[PDB]
Design a binder for this molecule. Structure first.
Ligand SMILES: C=C/C(C)=C\[C@@]1(C)SC(=O)C(C(C)=O)=C1O
Ligand SMILES: C=C/C(C)=C\[C@@]1(C)SC(=O)C(C(C)=O)=C1O
Ligand SMILES: [Cl-]
Ligand SMILES: [Cl-]
Ligand SMILES: [K+]
Ligand SMILES: [K+]
Lengths: 414, 414
C-alpha cells in the first residue's frame, strides 16, 4: 500500500505562498498580525447595511482592495474572482523567484465557492436594455466558474491540467488535495493551487443569516467570532484569497528553491446527512483526517497541531470536536484562525492551509481570539492568550463545507 | 509504473447507465433513435426567440421535461440542475437493481457547466420586493454549484466523497475521470458520476452567438449540426443529463452485476492558449488521449473507435482532427454524437461517455448526421450514412471545453 512515508508516493513540498486578507495584502505581515492578536473584523461601513436593516453589521473587507490593482481593461474582461486570481497568481510567481518550469508538467487547481455571480446579473441587464448584441463576446469567459483557474493557467502557462473543484467552504482545501494527487499520480511535477472568493455582499449575508449561522454581536466587532467558546453565536465574514506553489522535492532541489513545509496526504469524505448542517457524530469528518494520515504514513500520535475549521457556530464547533476525537487527534494543539480572519467560503481552506505551513516553518501557533470560556462539551487544547511556541512536527488542516464535504490535509515540517 | 493492463490499478467496470435527451427520457430508446438516424434538433417554439430576435432559432429540448416529474415541494427546495440530478440519481439506482452498498466506500462525482444560476436572480428579486427575510433559509443549498452532486450524495448515501469539477464543456467527462481516480487510489469501491446542465435559455444563446460559435441554419433544423463537414457553421444546443454507475470488477462480481464495459484510464491536460478557442496544433489535447492510454496500458494501435467532441465549429473540428493525429489514433472509426443530440455544455461529456460504453457493448457506431462532404483538412474516418457494425475492442471519449480543458477517457469491451 503506497504512502508518502514509505516512498510509494513522491515527496511533495510547499515552496511559495501568497494571500490577501482583512489584516494585510502581504502574507508575512498577516502572519505577524495574527501573532500579535490583531483581528480583521470591524463594523461594516457599507451603505447597504443601513439600506436593508441587516441583522449582521460586522465583517472584514480586504485591507487592500483587489481593484486598487486593476485598470480599465481588467475591469471589463474579468469577474472579481478572476481579477483576484490574476493578482495572486502574479504575486506567487514572483515570490517563487519567477522560475521557468516545463509547461507540460505544470498544473493549476483553484477552487471558489460561487464564481462570477455578479456578471450574470450584469449580462441580463444589458440584454434587457439593448438586446442580444449587447452581451459581450467575452461574457462566457467571465461567467464560467472555472474562470479564476482558467485565468491563472493562461497567465502562468500551465498545460498539465487546470481544474476547479467546488465544495462550498472546503473548495480551497479540496483544490490543494487534487493538486497533490495530480502530482503523486505522475500527471505533474509542479502545481499552483488554492482558492478565491468574492467580497462581502448583502445577499450572502441575508442567506447565511436566515440560517442563524452568523454572529450578530455588533457592538464588539472584534469579539464576535468565538470558535469553541461557550458564548459563540455563529460566524463572521472575512474576505480572502490564497495560493501556494507545490512541487516534488526533487524538482525543488534541482531549481534551488527552499521548501517551507511538506504536503504529505489528503483525505476527502462526505456526510450524506444534511444539505447544510454537519453530522453531529463527526465520524465521516474524522475519517477524512484518518485518510490523510494513512496516505501520509503517519499515526494520530504524530499530530502536534490541528488547524480547525472552527466556524464558531454551536453545532459546527461541536461536530468538529467529535471529528478530532474520532480521528484520535484530540491531544493536539488547536488553532481556529476564523477567530481573527473570519469565514471566506471558498478561499478559506486555502488561506488556512497557508497558515498551517507557516506554523510548521516557524514552530508557533497564533492565539485563538476571544477564547475565554472553554465549552464543557468540546474539551480541546485550544491555543489562546498569546502565541504558543512548540515543537510542531506534523499538522492537519481541516476544512468542511455545506453539503457535508470533508477535506483534511496532512503537512510536515521540512 | 502502475497501469490497468499490468494490475497496478484495479479493474473498474461500468454497471449501469441512465440519461435524458432530446430524443428520449430512456437511454436505450435514445440509442435506438441514434441508430435509426433520428435527430433531437428542431425549430425552437419558445416565445423568447421572437421576443429577442435571436439569430439562432433551433435546438433540442428534452423529449420529457424534468419538471413533469416534480411536485410543488421539489419545485421550491431545489434548482433545476438539482431536480435533474435527483431524477437521474433515482433512475440509475433502480437500473442497478437498487443495491445496498457500503456507504463509506461509495463516492459521487457530478459536474455541471454553470449551476443554479436562475436561483440567484430569484433570490435577488425577493430581497428587492420584501427585504432580507424573504430570502429562503434554504437558499444556500439551491445556489451552491456542488448542488446537484450534494443532492445525489444525500439521496443515495455516498460517504466516501461528493465532488463537483467544473470545466465548462468537459465537466461531465472530468467527473467520471475523478470518480475513476477516487476508486483506483483506494478511496472508494463504487461511484455514481456524470453531469447535468440547465435548459436552453436566451442568455446562453446570446453569449455563444456573439462568439459566432453557433449554427444559424434555421430553415433546416435537423441539418444544422454538421461536425467535420465541409459546410459546418457552429454548434446547436441540445438538452441532456447523464449518470453512470462504476465500481471495481471484484465488487461487481460479488453482487452479481453484469458489466456493460470497462473504464481503463483518464487523461486531463490544458492548452494555456486562449480563454475560449482551442489550440490549433491540437498537441495538449492529443496528449490527454495519450495519457489515458498510458494509464490504461494501451497503444494507439489498439484504439478502434473515437467518440469525438466534434462541436461543429470550424476551428474546433480542425483542432480535434489534429489532436487525434497527434495521439496516433487517426485510423480509428470516429463518431460525433452532437450531430444528432446537440451540445449540452456540462452534461455532454457524460452522455457521450454513456454512448461510448453502448458502442463497445453492442459493436455498433451510429451514423454522424449531416456528414455529406469530407473537409479536405480534416481527413478522419467518420462513420456516416448508416450505423457501422464493427469489432470495437477499445475506445476513447474526448471532451474539451472553453478554457482549453482537455479530458480523454479510455474504455474497453467487457
Ligand atoms: C460538514 C460541515 C457542514 C455541512 C457545515 C459546517 C460545519 S462547514 C461551514 O463552513 C459551516 C458554516 C455554518 O458556515 C457549517 O455549519
Ligand atoms: C479546448 C477546447 C476549447 C477551448 C474550445 C472548444 C473546441 S470545446 C467546445 O465545446 C467549443 C465550443 C465552441 O462550444 C469549442 O470551440
Ligand atoms: Cl478583447
Ligand atoms: Cl423544508
Ligand atoms: K482549518
Ligand atoms: K465525445
Amino acid at each position: 500500500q503506497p504512502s508518502t512515508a514509505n516512498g510509494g508516493f513522491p515527496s511533495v513540498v510547499v515552496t511559495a505562498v501568497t494571500a490577501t486578507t482583512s489584516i494585510s495584502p502581504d502574507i508575512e505581515s498577516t502572519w505577524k498580525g495574527l501573532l500579535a492578536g490583531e483581528s480583521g473584523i470591524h463594523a461594516l461601513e457599507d451603505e447597504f447595511v443601513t439600506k436593508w436593516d441587516l441583522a449582521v453589521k460586522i465583517g472584514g473587507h480586504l485591507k487592500d482592495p483587489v481593484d486598487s490593482h486593476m485598470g480599465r481593461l481588467d475591469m471589463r474582461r474579468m469577474s472579481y474572482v478572476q481579477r483576484m486570481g490574476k493578482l495572486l497568481g502574479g504575486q506567487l510567481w514572483e515570490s517563487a523567484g519567477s522560475p521557468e518550469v516545463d509547461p507540460d508538467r505544470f498544473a493549476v487547481v483553484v477552487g471558489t465557492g460561487l464564481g462570477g455571480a455578479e456578471r450574470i446579473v450584469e449580462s441580463y441587464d444589458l440584454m434587457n436594455a439593448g438586446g442580444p448584441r449587447k452581451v459581450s463576446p467575452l461574457a462566457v469567459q467571465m461567467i464560467m466558474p472555472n474562470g479564476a483557474a482558467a485565468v491563472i493557467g493562461l497567465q502562468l502557462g500551465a498545460r498539465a491540467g487546470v481544474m476547479t473543484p467546488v465544495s462550498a467552504c472546503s473548495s480551497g482545501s479540496e483544490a490543494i488535495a487534487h493538486a497533490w494527487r495530480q502530482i503523486v499520480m505522475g500527471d505533474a511535477d509542479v502545481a499552483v493551487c488554492g482558492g478565491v472568493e468574492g467580497p462581502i455582499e448583502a445577499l450572502p449575508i441575508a442567506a447565511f443569516s436566515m440560517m442563524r449561522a452568523m454572529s450578530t454581536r455588533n457592538d464588539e466587532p472584534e469579539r464576535a467570532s468565538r470558535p469553541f467558546d461557550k458564548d459563540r453565536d455563529g460566524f463572521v465574514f472575512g474576505e480572502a484569497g490564497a495560493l501556494m506553489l507545490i512541487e516534488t522535492e526533487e524538482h525543488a532541489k534541482a531549481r534551488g528553491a527552499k521548501p517551507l513545509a511538506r504536503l504529505l496526504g489528503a483525505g476527502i469524505t462526505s456526510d450524506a446527512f444534511h444539505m447544510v448542517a454537519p453530522a453531529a457524530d463527526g465520524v465521516r469528518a474524522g475519517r477524512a483526517m484518518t485518510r490523510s494520515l494513512e496516505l501520509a504514513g503517519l499515526s494520530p500520535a504524530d499530530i502536534d497541531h490541528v488547524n480547525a475549521h472552527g466556524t464558531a457556530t454551536p453545532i459546527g464547533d461541536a461536530a468538529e470536536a467529535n471529528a478530532i476525537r474520532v480521528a484520535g487527534c484530540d491531544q493536539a494543539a488547536v488553532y481556529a484562525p476564523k477567530s481573527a480572519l473570519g469565514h471566506s467560503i471558498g478561499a478559506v481552506g486555502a488561506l488556512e492551509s497557508v497558515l498551517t505551513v507557516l506554523t510548521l516553518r516557524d514552530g508557533v501557533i497564533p492565539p485563538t481570539l476571544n477564547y475565554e470560556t472553554p465549552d464543557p462539551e468540546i474539551d480541546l487544547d485550544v491555543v489562546a492568550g498569546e502565541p504558543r511556541y512548540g515543537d510542531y512536527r506534523y499538522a492537519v488542516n481541516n476544512s468542511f463545507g455545506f453539503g457535508g464535504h470533508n477535506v483534511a490535509l496532512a503537512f510536515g515540517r521540512y
